[PDB]
Amino acid sequence: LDYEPAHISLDPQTSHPKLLLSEDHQRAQFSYKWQNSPDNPQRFDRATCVLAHTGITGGRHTWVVSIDLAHGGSCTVGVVSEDVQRKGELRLRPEEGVWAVRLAWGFVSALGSFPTRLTLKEQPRQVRVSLDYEVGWVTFTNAVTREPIYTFTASFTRKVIPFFGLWGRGSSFSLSS
């Protein structure tokens, strides 16, 4: 509970063409249109994902993702090693530097080679990500109720970057701390 609220801004260099970022870089929604997004090496081309601008190399840090799934979409939240594969079919799993949870209506899972289905007391509106770089914890909780969701144990050898994904029109997320 000594996790330091962090500023997150979504990096428009990284965002899949199917994600629309807000002017303030605090929100994203799944867009009906592929944008004519410059295909620079930092940009996801298949995974409908976006990174934060600023990575973490130490300490304890925490941020909150508010999730709105209007019509059976999904949202993915977590952290990636900064050398995560961005081009092609990415497998979201620890082995490939992804520590993330996927939320849909009636469906939450921790992503790995062997995804873990999680049944919660409530459908999370808000997911708190609490990262302890020093120990190697990625903790997910319901940011309103503090209900535990999942904890990954990780060995960080590189910078880690807050990670977000959306699938399906009417799906969106917004950031706070």
∠ CA(130), CA(135), CA(139), 5° rounding? 25
Q: Characterize the bridge pairing of strands 126-132 and 137-142.
A: antiparallel
∠ CA(36), CA(67), CA(69), 5° rounding? 75
Rounded to whole angstroms, the Cα distance separating 104 from 60 reads 28
- What DSSP state is assigned to residue 28? E
- What DSSP state is assigned to residue 10? B
Listed by start position, the domains of the chain span 4-176
- What DSSP state is assigned to residue 58? S
Single out the residue of 68, 41, 38, 25 nearest to residue 162, CA to CA: 25
What the block records as the tokens of 28 is 């994203």
For residue 56, how many other CB atoms are within 10 A of its CB?
Answer: 19
User: DSSP secondary structure string, 88-153?
Assistant: S----SGGGTEEEEEEETTEEEE-SSS-EEE--SS--SEEEEEEETTTTEEEEEETTT--EEEEEE
What the block records as the tokens of 118 is 């999680």
Q: Is 176 helix (H, G, I), strand (E, B) or coil?
A: strand
Rounded to whole angstroms, the Cα distance separating 63 from 13 reads 21
Q: Which approach determined this entry? A: X-ray
Instruction: Give the CATH number of domain 4-176.
Output: 2.60.120.920
Task: Give residues with Cβ within 8 angstroms of 24, minimum separation 6.
Answer: none
Instruction: Give the CA diameter of the chain.
Output: 42
Contact between residue 81 and residue 155 where contact means Cβ atoms under 8 Å apart: no
